[PDB]
Amino acid sequence: NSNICEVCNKWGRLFCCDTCPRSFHEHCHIPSVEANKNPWSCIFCRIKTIQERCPESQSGHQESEVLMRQMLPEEQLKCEFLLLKVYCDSKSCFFASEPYYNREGSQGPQKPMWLNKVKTSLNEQMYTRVEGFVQDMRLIFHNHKEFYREDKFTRLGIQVQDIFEKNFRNIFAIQETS
Numbered sequence: 001n002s003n004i005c006e007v008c009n010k011w012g013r014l015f016c017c018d019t020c021p022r023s024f025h026e027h028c029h030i031p032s033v034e035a036n037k038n039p040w041s042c043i044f045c046r047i048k049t050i051q052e053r054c055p056e057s058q059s060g061h062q063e064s065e066v067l068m069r070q071m072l073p074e075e076q077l078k079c080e081f082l083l084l085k086v087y088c089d090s091k092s093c094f095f096a097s098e099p100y101y102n103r104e105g106s107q108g109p110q111k112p113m114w115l116n117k118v119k120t121s122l123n124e125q126m127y128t129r130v131e132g133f134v135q136d137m138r139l140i141f142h143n144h145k146e147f148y149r150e151d152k153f154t155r156l157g158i159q160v161q162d163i164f165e166k167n168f169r170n171i172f173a174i175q176e177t178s
């Protein structure tokens with residue numbers, strides 16, 4: 001197994017996957033690494049299994065259809081993995097915890113949103129469709145763009161949104177377009 005957490009790239013108390021060489025901190029893995037389960041398979045392995053069981057699940061899809069899917073076990077897992085892929089980027093630190101807004105010439109957003117709030121919402125099964133999860137994720141970056149206006153710090157939101165959107169297209173097998 002790897003000697004660092006796959007998500008945060010630090011050593012520490014790590015749990016090792018039995019079917020691939022990745023390792024995780026307890027709360028870096030999503031869902032949080034399970035108490036028992038020998039062997040244990042990480043979320044990367046579980047996602048790969050879905051694809052292997054149904055190769056046709058990788059044919060192209062329309063975003064509009066994906067968003068309307070109910071949050072059954074497989075779509076729940078896919079959103080957990082997409083969330084994890086965002087946390088894997090170090091720039092996710094800016095969007096992880098609850099923000100506050102006091103900047104001359106800007107007003108805070110009507111509906112603040114952050115990664116740990118989405119994490120909790122997934123854990124507590126508060127989304128009924130894929131749409132609910134994707135809307136909250138996109139709202140994080142949209143709030144950031146709006147608040148920071150012409151400050152160059154707005155680019156952090158563009159960067160992390162791009163990581164989200166690429167991973168969304170990959171995980172849910174969105175039809176490639178020009």
Ligand SMILES: [Zn+2]
Nearest residue numbers: 005008025028
């Ligand atoms: Zn970690």
Ligand SMILES: [Zn+2]
Nearest residue numbers: 017020042045
């Ligand atoms: Zn694994």
Ligand SMILES: [Zn+2]
Nearest residue numbers: 053054055056
């Ligand atoms: Zn199939």
